[PDB]
Design a protein around this nucleic acid. Structure first.
Ligand code: CA
Length: 744
RNA sequence: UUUUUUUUUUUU
């Protein structure tokens, strides 16, 4: 058939005028047409696809009609650099925009992409580190185009998919784009990708910067731009060949630095507040490192009882009502004692002066202890400059730094990226799901330490997720290692949900894991701490912190359905429960039930017993078991580490011998936050890949006619069985004969 | 009453 191939070649040539998503499926579908024998059938299937191609070809033409007017406000400094960047984007595959806080590049960058003509044949993805950053930026570009969000400009987050068929700009969290990679590895949905706030150097951000480097050869038609602050924009250019950089000014008033080093710590803060009161009676933002540190400074400043003041705290876990109190109205004098939330996420309003002690809690993975550590460290130069920048908003400000300039200049320029200091267990799991087994070959922007990667590989083996196909360093995951990839939860938690089906507890396991994936919805406010406890202690199980979630879950589900929507938000307030988190605890549970149902795992309708729910949970907590010390309230855990039970635990008063905790974190000691009693008999059937068997005192016993010994099974060093006499002859007959021969 | 409290966040 040569005329049939003319209708074939002419059709593909037309197919270049379609959306990239459509252009792929039709091109494959045509390549399977000549496979059919009958040419009479072919002429019937070209005619149909051309009818479907015609709809798709018209789809883009209709789409171009919905392109709106392009408007750039003259307030923003980026509107001046607009002509410089626009030329750079069309001419270069990769462009990098870095600007100060005032620039307004974030809102106007999607507009320049549209002015270039992108967004019609394929979507333009814009990625933000937090949800609200994705949501507010979308709502802002809609405002500036006299359209409403979800239309031309849309945003997708974990539970809101506000996108339409005429959408051209897609705001989203960086993790959303990652979830889309398994389904669409070539990212054919998008015509251009803009990555914003890349200076934060998140684990997702760093992984995206690698994956995009890998597909650029297979996606020449797409162009990509990465955006950040003026902090190390040359790393990004080096990553993508030598990509062009464009810098934009910011609208901020000048800030002055005053280095004043050195209860000696608390006294230094007093002198700083006294100095600021002389020069002006303005707001002071004092960065604080912890709830205990914010509580000690708050009691100190309120103890002085300054006449015209208000001591107002702000931290991440604070009540959404009490947190949003800072964003109301300035009256009298306000000094806000805040933590990192005021450095990146929140941006506290009405600030004139900022006091920087230069200390912050940073999360680190100790590949010695294999435990998450939260030390209080000196912050980086960039972190101090970010704190310094949170004070110049509307009027001229000054920033006082409570340390010497030589200390500041001695500090690293930038904080360590997250990929370098967290466990890569889930990271490598998702990589193996995509076929990216060789982690050394993956083009990281900052490659992690080799020993750090292997810790993740070991944890996956601990969960049964990974194996190698007798290769050197390219892994292939197991059938449940792929199911662990399908659940959007921590690998430890995903593993217990899978093991949950062998026992009658999939509902309970989904409740537990969902709760452990959020900040604790139960709130313990700074005032009425004991009052909060009596309200929270209604559901405490005598020996299981995990079961407390189940009781609380059934309670809230029953009260949500029994009374109104407004009366429920009140019941959340009167029981010290964050409504939004209680809501999200349900949304994760609902998402789990989807994939759990989609994988065919049956979910129970009956309540389960204590042993089955917790045996299922133990599957993800094998490194998190401990044995109590005799006549001591301390625990010996995995390896030779020692941890104490968290004080807010239902079994803190009466700690059993054998425990499992959900989380081990080291601050001053090693704390096991969510804990429950376990029987050591349970640990052996699940740790077959981990147990180490040692045999001792071998002797020949006449009655049974075999050699006997005392065996001690050991997981991560812990004696699950201290000793039990067993016939050594069945265990290793050759060795027993050799001992019998040598008379021993 | 024998141990008295943990930075910021993202999704398949
Ligand atoms: Ca929609």
């Amino acid at each position: 058939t040569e005329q049939q191939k003319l209708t074939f070649t002419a059709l593909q040539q037309r197919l270049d005028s379609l959306m990239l998503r459509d252009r792929l499926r039709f091109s494959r579908r045509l390549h399977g047409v000549k496979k059919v024998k009958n040419p009479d059938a072919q002429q019937a299937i070209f005619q149909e696809m051309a009818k479907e191609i015609d709809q798709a070809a018209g789809k883009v033409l209709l789409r171009e009609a919905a392109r709106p007017e392009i408007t750039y406000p003259d307030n923003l400094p980026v509107s001046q650099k607009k002509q410089d960047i626009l030329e750079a984007i069309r001419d270069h595959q990769v462009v990098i925009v870095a600007g100060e806080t005032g620039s307004g590049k974030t809102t106007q960058l999607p507009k320049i992409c549209m002015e270039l003509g992108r967004g019609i044949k394929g979507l333009i993805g814009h990625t933000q580190p937090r949800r609200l950053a994705a949501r507010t930026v979308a709502n802002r570009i809609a405002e500036e185009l006299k359209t409403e969000p979800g239309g031309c400009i849309g945003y997708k987050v974990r539970f809101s998919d506000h996108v339409s068929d005429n959408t051209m700009v897609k705001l989203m969290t960086d993790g959303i784009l990652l979830a889309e990679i398994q389904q669409d590895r070539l990212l054919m949905q998008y015509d251009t990708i803009i990555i914003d706030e890349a200076h934060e150097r998140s684990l997702n951000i760093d992984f995206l910067l690698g994956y995009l480097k890998e597909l650029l050869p297979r996606r020449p038609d797409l162009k990509i731009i990465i955006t950040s602050a003026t902090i190390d924009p040359e790393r990004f250019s080096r990553h993508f060949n030598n990509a062009p950089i464009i810098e934009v000014s910011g609208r901020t008033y000048p800030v002055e630095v005053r280095y004043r080093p050195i209860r000696d710590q608390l006294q230094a803060i007093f002198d700083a507040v006294d100095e600021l009161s002389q020069e002006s009676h303005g707001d002071i933002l004092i960065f604080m490192s912890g709830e205990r540190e914010i509580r000690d400074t708050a009691d100190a400043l309120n103890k002085l009882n300054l006449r015209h003041t208000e001591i107002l705290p702000l931290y991440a876990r604070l009540s959404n009502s009490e947190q949003n109190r800072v964003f109301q109205s300035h009256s009298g004098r306000r000094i806000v004692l805040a933590t990192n939330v005021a450095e990146t996420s929140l941006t506290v309003p009405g600030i004139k002066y900022v006091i920087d002690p230069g200390t912050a809690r940073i999360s680190r993975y100790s590949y010695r202890t294999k435990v998450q550590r939260l030390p209080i460290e000196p912050i980086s130069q960039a972190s101090a400059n970010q704190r310094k920048g949170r004070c110049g908003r509307v009027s001229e400000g000054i920033c006082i730094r409570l340390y010497s300039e030589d200390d500041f200049l001695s500090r690293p320029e930038f904080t360590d990226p997250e990929i370098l200091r967290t466990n890569l267990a889930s990271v490598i799991l998702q990589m193996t799901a995509l076929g990216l087994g060789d982690i050394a070959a993956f083009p990281f922007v900052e490659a992690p330490d080799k020993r750090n990667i292997q810790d993740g590989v070991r944890l996956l083996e601990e969960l049964g997720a990974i194996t190698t196909d007798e290769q050197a360093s390219a892994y292939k995951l197991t059938p449940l290692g792929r199911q662990l990839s399908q659940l959007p939860v921590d690998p430890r938690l995903a593993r217990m949900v899978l093991e949950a089906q062998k026992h009658g507890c999939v509902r309970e396991a989904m409740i537990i894991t969902s709760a452990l994936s959020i900040q604790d919805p139960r709130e313990r406010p700074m005032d009425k701490q004991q009052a909060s406890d009596e309200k929270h202690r209604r559901f405490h199980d005598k020996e299981s912190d995990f079961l407390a979630f189940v009781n609380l879950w059934n309670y809230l589900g029953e009260q949500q359905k029994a009374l109104s929507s407004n009366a429920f938000r009140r019941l959340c307030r009167t029981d010290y429960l964050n409504y939004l988190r209680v809501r999200e605890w349900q949304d994760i549970y609902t998402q789990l039930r989807q994939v759990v149902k989609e994988l065919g795992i049956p979910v129970n309708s009956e309540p389960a017993e204590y042993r089955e729910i917790h045996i299922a949970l133990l599957t993800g907590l094998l490194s998190h078991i401990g044995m109590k010390d005799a006549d001591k309230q301390e625990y010996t855990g995995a390896r030779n580490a020692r941890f104490s039970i968290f004080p807010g635990s239902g079994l803190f008063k009466k700690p059993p011998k054998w425990v499992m905790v959900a989380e081990l974190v080291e601050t001053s000691r090693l704390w096991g936050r969510i804990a429950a009693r376990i029987d050591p008999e349970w640990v052996e059937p699940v740790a077959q890949h981990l147990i180490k068997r040692t045999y001792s005192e071998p002797h020949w016993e006449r009655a049974q006619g075999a050699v006997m010994a005392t065996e001690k099974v050991t997981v991560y060093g812990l004696p699950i069985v201290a000793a039990r006499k067993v016939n050594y002859s069945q265990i290793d007959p050759a060795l027993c004969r050799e001992l019998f021969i040598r008379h021993a």
